C-alpha cells in the first residue's frame, strides 16, 4: 500500500 510505504497510515490499524 502506497500510503503505508510513505508513512501516512499504519497497516496494523
Amino acid at each position, epitope marked *: 500500500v502506497a*500510503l*503505508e510505504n*510513505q*508513512h501516512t497510515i*499504519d497497516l496494523t490499524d
Partner: antibody
Amino acid sequence: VQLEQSGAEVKKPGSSVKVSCKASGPMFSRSAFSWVRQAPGQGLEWMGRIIPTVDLKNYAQKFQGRVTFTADKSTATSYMELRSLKSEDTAVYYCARMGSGSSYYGMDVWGLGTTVTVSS
Amino acid sequence: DIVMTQSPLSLPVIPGEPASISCRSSQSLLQSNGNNYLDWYLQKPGQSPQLLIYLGSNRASGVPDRFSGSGSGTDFTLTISRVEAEDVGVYYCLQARQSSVLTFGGGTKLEIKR
C-alpha cells in the same frame, strides 16, 4: 525477553534454515518485524520486514527470491526462512520490532539473535 | 536505491569530551509528513543493537540527553556531548524513507581514548 528467537543452527551449503521470533500477543498485532543479519566482524544488513497482521512482506533486493517470511497469528510467532545457503550466510540473524508506516519510530525492540553457521 | 555513508570508520575520544559522527544519504530522507527517516543505533560489545535516535533527532526512551541527533535531507550528525566508558561500541545510521526499504550505514566504532 520481549522477543524470543530459536536456537543456533548449523546447515550444509545449499540447504535451508528457518529462524523464529516470538512476541507477545499485543506486540505481534501492532508491529512490523525486521530481519537484520550480521556476518562475523561485519556490520548490520537489513534483509526485509513482515507485517504479520496484513501478511505483508518486503524483501531487500539482495535477498529477493531465496528468503521467505511467514507468520503464525495463533502463536504470535514470525519466521525467516533462508534457502540455498552459502558460506557468506554464516551470521547472527536478529529479529527487530517496529511500527508500520505512520507508526514507525525506529526498530525499538530487538531479539537476542540466532547464530546460523553454514558448513559442509 | 539509497546508499548510506557513515564517517569516520573509527573515532577515538578522550573521556568527558564530545564526539561527532556523520551519516550521508544518497537521497533526501525528508518525507511529506516533515520527518527525516534517519535513525541511529548502538551495538555494545556482545549485545544486540539498540535504538538510540529515531527519525533524525528523537531520543529513544532511557537514552541520556548527552546523545543528540541533528540534520535534515541528506546530511545527519550524532553528537555525544560528553563521551563516557559505557558508550563504547559501534554506532550505525539507518534510513527508512520508504517503510518497505531500510538500509544501514557502514558503522562507526567509538573508541574511548583512556
